[PDB]
Design a protein around this ligand. Structure first.
Ligand SMILES: [Mg+2]
Ligand SMILES: [Mg+2]
Ligand SMILES: [Mg+2]
Ligand SMILES: [Mg+2]
Ligand SMILES: [Mg+2]
Ligand SMILES: [Mg+2]
Ligand SMILES: [Mg+2]
Ligand SMILES: [Mg+2]
Ligand SMILES: [Mg+2]
Ligand SMILES: [Mg+2]
Ligand SMILES: [Mg+2]
Ligand SMILES: [Mg+2]
Ligand SMILES: [Mg+2]
Ligand SMILES: [Mg+2]
Ligand SMILES: [Mg+2]
Ligand SMILES: [Mg+2]
Ligand SMILES: [Mg+2]
Ligand SMILES: [Mg+2]
Ligand SMILES: [Mg+2]
Ligand SMILES: [Mg+2]
Ligand SMILES: [Mg+2]
Ligand SMILES: [Mg+2]
Ligand SMILES: [Mg+2]
Ligand SMILES: [Mg+2]
Ligand SMILES: [Mg+2]
Ligand SMILES: [Mg+2]
Ligand SMILES: [Mg+2]
Ligand SMILES: [Mg+2]
Ligand SMILES: [Mg+2]
Ligand SMILES: [Mg+2]
Ligand SMILES: [Mg+2]
Ligand SMILES: [Mg+2]
Ligand SMILES: [Mg+2]
Ligand SMILES: [Mg+2]
Ligand SMILES: [Mg+2]
Ligand SMILES: [Mg+2]
Ligand SMILES: [Mg+2]
Ligand SMILES: [Mg+2]
Ligand SMILES: [Mg+2]
Ligand SMILES: [Mg+2]
Ligand SMILES: [Mg+2]
Lengths: 187, 105, 159, 147
RNA sequence: ACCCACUAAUAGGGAACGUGAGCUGGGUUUAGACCGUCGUGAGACAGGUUAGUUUUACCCUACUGAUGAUGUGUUGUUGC
RNA sequence: CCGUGGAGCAGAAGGGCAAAAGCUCGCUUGAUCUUGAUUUUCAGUACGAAUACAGACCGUGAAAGCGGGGCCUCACGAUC
RNA sequence: AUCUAAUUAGUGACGCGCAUGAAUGGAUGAACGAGAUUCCCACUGUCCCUACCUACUAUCCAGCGAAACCACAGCCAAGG
RNA sequence: CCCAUACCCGGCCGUCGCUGGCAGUCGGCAGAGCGAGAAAGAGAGUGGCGCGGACGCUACGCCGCGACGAGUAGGAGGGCCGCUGCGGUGAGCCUUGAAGCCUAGGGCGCGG
RNA sequence: AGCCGGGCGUGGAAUGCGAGUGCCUAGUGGGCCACUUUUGGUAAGCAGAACUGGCGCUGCGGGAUGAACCGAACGCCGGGU
RNA sequence: UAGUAGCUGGUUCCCUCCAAAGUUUCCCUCAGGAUAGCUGGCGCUCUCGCCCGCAGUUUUAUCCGGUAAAGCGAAU
RNA sequence: CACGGCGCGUCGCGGCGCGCGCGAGCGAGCGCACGGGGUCGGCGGCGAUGUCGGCUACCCACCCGACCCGUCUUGAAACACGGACCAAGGAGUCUAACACGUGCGCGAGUCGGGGGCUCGCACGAAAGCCGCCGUGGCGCAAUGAAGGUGAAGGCCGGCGUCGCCGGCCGAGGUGGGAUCCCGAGGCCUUCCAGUCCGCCGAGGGCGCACCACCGGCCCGUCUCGCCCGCCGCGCCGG
């Protein structure tokens, strides 16, 4: 008999991608080897992010990437994102960038290639920089999904700006009792 | 009974909906039959246009669509008269004609 | 069941001490509370304006807002299985500076001073408060008088 | 598929994952949205405030087509025309400005949100906003109304 | 409970307030009725009154009796 | 003359109160308009009640100030 | 009061009637009643207190043959 | 002195943790290491005969160390557990005997 | 009071231990018992509370027997105590 | 019309891991629900191989109280 | 006595401590074992129609243990209920909606589901194609009951006690932040000069996502106050 608790004995993190495609699994093999036979933690972070799910790999926009690479000090370094690089149409001037991503939108790829940059895939990234020196690791906005507007402190409760679940927006849908001081109460 | 959190729903299945159900298992057969009838009529009218009579230019009657142009029901009598076409001969020579439409412009 | 009145069961908690009724001494009114002082709550029944609820009596909080006559303070309250840091407004009579913080402040000043000193001397000095160590060996000198016997006394009834 | 569902793993457990004390009865709380104000009041108030009551005016024969008015923003404003148009206007020296008609592309009102690149534009629309107007004027350009 | 008589004495109790596939069914306690009190009424009354189907054992055990079994080689007589 | 409250403060009780919160006069209507925050039951939701503010119009006083109902703890009510 | 040795029964009176009473009928009453009660004569196995006899069964045999019921089953005392 | 499923030592199963190790099978074109108390190069350079060497690695694999293992209601995972039919595949099986059924026979798996 | 800039590491009690955070969510909403405290009751294997631990959900050694007591909580085995 | 049932009865293979509640508030609510609480699953953000935090524990300081006890030569 | 060379020995207190050179930090073999988990390079018998082995499984005996399951229940072996036995059948399914988590394609877009074109037709009622068939849905803008309105700005020259035109720069700030950049110093062997390449690393940078906080902008509403525009100078508009 030992006075211990087994509730949190097992950790929940992912050991391998839930996906079944073969290209991602080959990438996982390569980066598993790199992470376990290299002291650099960039490989560990990249492999962990390869394991993650789709909603945990949000797309990164061209405007975000250029904005985060225009910061001082990080010139002529390769921007690495484990998600999808999507094009942003509300930006005219695009510089030359050295991008690496699993997949890139067709229009975004056309824009970068026209601007003069080059697109890399995580394989060739391994060949170029195994330990990943000169890399700027970016990611898309994880809280960008609209489901996060429904989360948190419940609506109809003071100081809670949480979106309710309504089938249609209008004046006849959840506007009368809990939303007005004129009818009952106002939270 | 409501669960923790979710949407209030109003499913309209409080009638005997299972007696009036329209399955679409005859959709491909319907498409085949419509096609066959279409080609049969096209063969029946030998040199005539398969689509039918020509139709006129009309503007959609709404703020939402008044920028678009449709195909109308038929040419009106003012247009036929000013084009020199008899209202009775237009139909037999292939012009769709209706007398309801006016011409404000 | 019980009653949910705001002052239920406070006949001794909000009462005044023996032979201490009457005019509130003015020193309580003439103290300065700034933003961030650690302060004690003790409801005084002499004044009824801005009296804290009975569940904060004897609790210590942190001042976060200062106002003409009252002070807003953040204090922790244990509600079932969770603790809420909630902010309440108390008039200045029912409040009192906590002396638990000034001791630590004085200790900070003093050990900072003794750290600044002896820095040039290079000697070692202890700052952490070690717990009471076990007593060290020593000698107990008898002065020629032998210790006297102690014996239990016989039982004999009093009442 | 029925292969992967919880029922297959539940065979042999008398109870079927619904408890022994409180069984799986027919409708313990009432059907549908019953008791919204009586015994589901806490849930309704906590998760759907404003459900009960009336507010606003009644409009009987509503026609969405009258109020149809799609909007566009200035950051998207240059995407209505081809890129070659914009670059030609950019390297043009005569000062001529391209004409962008949002009604042709299916927008009625122009709202001014994004930053506008510094080149003259002739924006013709049906409705404008004050900030969009001032953005166009500041960048240099013209605002034209159409019906 | 009370009384009459005898007696030696007419002590007190338990056993699912022993005992209804043992009896009886007078009483409680269905449905029919009557009276008194209560209720506007249908009706109510630890109020009174009258009439109101009491099913089954061949099973197991228990018990009462009746064959028999058990070892002494087989049987029989007399016996403890 | 003595008188620490042994009286009174609308009401139950408890707390509180002496150049006052009691008694008597003077003048008044902060029991007025308005947005937020907080406490009490609490799910930390409403109602009710209450607490500090802030913005105007005022009352009172020589003034500092005090006052947006009753010295505090109770006297009250969603949708349509 | 009578009836008996003995009477919570019956009858006849008494009436302060918990709560009798006049076509929600009061009182009486010949004849009648598979109506409800008490007493007396006669008669008797109802009983003291049981016994014997007859017929059909039950019993055994030839033939023919179900059903109720059945967790497993079936010797007791005490304990829990 | 006696003994519990408790405690100590040992074996075995499984779970969890180390988000541990292994692509270095680098071979006459080679040189067999990265267990060793001390953050980091068996560093590269310039001047004063016999032809030879086990296993491995379904990487969704293999291997090494520790700790742990009760369970109703309930939740989750893995089943090379099972039943019926469909698309593929086994140059599959079968009148020299399929399905089904019976068995004091030989076995496998903790179990289905 | 808020802002900037600058200097100070002996990380200022003991002991132990990775921590924080977000969704979705079943069952439950009849309880009972014991030391101590305690209300009603003559009292009860009665009725009602507070704290902790148990039983329920739990087998094992002991109390002959036993939901709760004493010891001790459990993968399949050998040895020892 | 397979009418409704907050009420009985039943609810079909194996192993592995985790593991409860009969309590709060509201309800013509009291054999039932909703809501907190207790559970599981899925993760994610970092961490060590100088330092961060946390604790059903103690220590050093500092406040809070009106029970056990005691008192009536002190108030009631 | 886990003492053992020679020196230059101050590297020194008076010698010991304790430094600098000595082809420059390379002596080799054998052997025994209380040494990173057992071996014997030790043996003996009995084997053809009566004997050898067969955990389990067939029957039987013995010792210990052992109450009949399912169910409701605080509590079941219960003097609680269902159950004589056997075979077959037998109960969380399908549609719609919603939410969330996961896998795939495309991505500010996305989706032909309806229709049409494909010599209709074993499969094929499938599959392919439409792109001037994206009507349309969802998303890209919110807010207000409605009329309606509808999402940054920061610096210099031109009249700080600037009216007001240009030159610009551009979508905030603080704290914490995985990673990356730099890098004082530091990683060896005859010495010595002197490199290359790679690893280490004080401190210092740029700081993803995300959290907290402070600002800013859009719509409704309230308070205060001034200014500006004209096709119609007004109960106008900003
Ligand atoms: Mg264990
Ligand atoms: Mg868990
Ligand atoms: Mg539920
Ligand atoms: Mg279960
Ligand atoms: Mg239920
Ligand atoms: Mg249901
Ligand atoms: Mg009997
Ligand atoms: Mg009778
Ligand atoms: Mg009767
Ligand atoms: Mg017989
Ligand atoms: Mg006065
Ligand atoms: Mg004011
Ligand atoms: Mg007054
Ligand atoms: Mg008689
Ligand atoms: Mg009489
Ligand atoms: Mg009468
Ligand atoms: Mg009369
Ligand atoms: Mg009468
Ligand atoms: Mg016979
Ligand atoms: Mg062990
Ligand atoms: Mg287990
Ligand atoms: Mg058999
Ligand atoms: Mg229940
Ligand atoms: Mg009790
Ligand atoms: Mg437990
Ligand atoms: Mg136990
Ligand atoms: Mg005993
Ligand atoms: Mg043992
Ligand atoms: Mg049914
Ligand atoms: Mg019920
Ligand atoms: Mg029940
Ligand atoms: Mg008390
Ligand atoms: Mg006492
Ligand atoms: Mg035995
Ligand atoms: Mg039952
Ligand atoms: Mg239970
Ligand atoms: Mg019974
Ligand atoms: Mg029952
Ligand atoms: Mg039965
Ligand atoms: Mg079957
Ligand atoms: Mg849900």
């Amino acid at each position: 008999g030992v006075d211990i608790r087994h509730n949190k004995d097992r950790k929940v993190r992912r050991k391998e991608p839930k996906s079944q495609d073969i290209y991602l699994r080959l990438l996982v093999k390569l980066y598993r080897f790199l992470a376990r036979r290299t002291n650099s933690t960039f490989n560990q972070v990249v492999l962990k992010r390869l394991f993650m799910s789709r909603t945990n790999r949000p797309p990164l926009s061209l405007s975000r990437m250029i904005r985060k690479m225009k910061l001082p000090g990080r010139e002529n370094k390769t921007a690495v994102v484990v998600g999808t690089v999507t094009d942003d149409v509300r930006v005219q001037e695009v510089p030359k960038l050295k991008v690496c991503a699993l997949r890139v939108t067709s229009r975004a790829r056309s824009r970068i290639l026209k601007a003069g940059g080059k697109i890399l895939t995580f394989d060739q990234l391994a060949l170029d920089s195994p330990k990943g020196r000169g890399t700027v690791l970016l990611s898309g906005p994880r809280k960008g999904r609209e489901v996060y507007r429904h989360f948190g402190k419940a609506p109809g409760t003071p100081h809670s700006h949480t979106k309710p679940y309504v089938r249609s927006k209008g004046r006849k849908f959840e506007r009368a009792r809990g939303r007005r001081a004129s009818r009952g109460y106002k939270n | 009974a409501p669960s923790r959190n979710g949407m209030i729903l109003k499913p309209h299945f409080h009638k005997d909906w299972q007696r009036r159900v329209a399955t679409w298992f005859n959709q491909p057969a319907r498409k085949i039959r419509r096609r066959k009838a279409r080609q049969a009529r096209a063969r029946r009218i030998a040199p005539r246009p398969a689509a039918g009579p020509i139709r006129p230019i009309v503007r959609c009657p709404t703020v939402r669509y008044h920028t678009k142009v449709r195909a109308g029901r038929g040419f009106s009598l003012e247009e036929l008269r000013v084009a020199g076409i008899h209202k009775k001969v237009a139909r037999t020579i292939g012009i769709s004609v209706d007398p309801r439409r006016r011409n404000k412009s | 069941t019980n009653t949910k009145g705001k002052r239920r069961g406070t006949r001794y908690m909000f009462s005044r001490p023996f032979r201490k009724h009457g005019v509130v001494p003015l020193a309580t009114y003439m103290r300065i509370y700034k933003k961030g002082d650690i302060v004690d709550i003790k409801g005084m029944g002499t004044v009824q304006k801005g009296m804290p609820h009975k569940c904060y009596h004897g609790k210590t909080g942190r001042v976060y807002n200062v106002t003409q006559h009252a002070v807003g303070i953040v204090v922790n309250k244990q509600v079932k299985g969770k603790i809420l840091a909630k902010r309440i407004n108390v008039r200045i009579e029912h409040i009192k500076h906590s002396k638990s913080r000034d001791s630590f402040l004085k200790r900070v000043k003093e050990n900072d001073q003794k750290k600044k000193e002896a820095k040039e001397k290079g000697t070692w000095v202890q700052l952490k408060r070690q717990p009471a160590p076990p007593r060290e060996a020593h000698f107990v000198r008898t002065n020629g008088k032998e210790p006297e016997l102690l014996e239990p006394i016989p039982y004999e009834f009093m009442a | 598929p029925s292969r992967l569902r919880k029922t297959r793993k539940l065979r042999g457990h008398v109870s079927h994952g619904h408890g022994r004390i409180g069984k799986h009865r027919k409708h313990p709380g009432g059907r549908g949205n019953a008791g919204g104000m009586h015994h589901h009041r806490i849930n309704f108030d906590k998760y759907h405030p404003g459900y009960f009551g009336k507010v606003g005016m009644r409009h009987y024969h509503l026609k969405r087509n009258q109020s149809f008015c799609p909007t566009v923003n200035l950051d998207k404003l240059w995407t209505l025309v081809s890129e070659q148009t914009r670059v030609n206007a950019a390297k043009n020296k005569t000062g001529a400005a391209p004409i962008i008609d949002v009604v042709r592309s299916g927008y009625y009102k122009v709202l001014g949100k994004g930053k506008l690149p510094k080149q003259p534009v002739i924006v013709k629309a049906k409705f404008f906003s004050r900030r969009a107007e001032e953005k166009i004027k500041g960048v240099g350009g013209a605002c034209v109304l159409v019906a």
